[PDB]
Amino acid sequence: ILYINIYPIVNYPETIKVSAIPYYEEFLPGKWKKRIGDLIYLYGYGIENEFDEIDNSNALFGKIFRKYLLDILSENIATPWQLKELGSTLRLVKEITENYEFSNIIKLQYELIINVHHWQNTNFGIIVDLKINILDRENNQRISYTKIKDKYGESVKKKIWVSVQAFHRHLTPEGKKYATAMRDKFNLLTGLLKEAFGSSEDEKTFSTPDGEIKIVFKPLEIV
Ligand SMILES: C[As](C)(=O)[O-]
Ligand SMILES: [Cl-]
Ligand code: NA
């Protein structure tokens, strides 16, 4: 039983309202709109009175829905997660607030990286990657292990790496290898994804102007 980091959208609007205008140079990309070739399509909360409807049998549907999906998710982020990047990709972050040695000088931050996967014409899912960013707490900037070693010394470097591995569940909280690591790492991913979208249940529905989007917070299974 193989589990993949893709969380399926099991319901979405089979029809969505879109507006098209010609692309123009001053266009600034943003929510509720997408450039497609030499048109910009408005959708979701960007729809003015003027509109056309497109269904999932149309190639345009997937090109729009892949972005609309992220736009909606971006409207449903729960504290303490924050939006870091929205566009073709959705990145959310939160600070690791549990204790670890050298937390006073080194800030750790989980980052969920959310992309949309589309396959067999009508299937959508979010592909979700988890990274931990390591920040120098005094200036809130990214800091490499080498720079930690130079600035705070070898001991801090080594300890941070163990803490990072423990927060990824690559090691036990005590810093040791364990047997059940890929199961627990998936549970962590699923649990953080649930938290980030305010979900206590293994599925959640999100409202859109076109109808509901339903996501199941359970990784796809290849048996
Ligand atoms: C109208 As809205 C949910 O895009 O702020
Ligand atoms: Cl765009
Ligand atoms: Na539907």
Author numbering: 20 to 242
Which lines from the publication concern this structure?
Comparison of this 172 aa ORF to a homologous sequence found in a nearly identical AfAgo-encoding genetic island present in the genome of a related strain A. fulgidus DSM88774 revealed that it contains a premature STOP codon due to a 2 bp deletion. We were able to solve its structure by X-ray crystallography in two symmetry groups: P1 (resolution 1.85 Å) and P3221 (resolution 1.4 Å). Two full-length upstream protein chains found in the asymmetric unit of the P1 structure, and a single chain found in the asymmetric unit of the P3221 structure overlap with an RMSD of 0.85 Å (determined using PDBe Fold).
Although phylogenetically classified as a long-B pAgo, AfAgo contains only MID and catalytically inactive PIWI domains, akin to short pAgos.
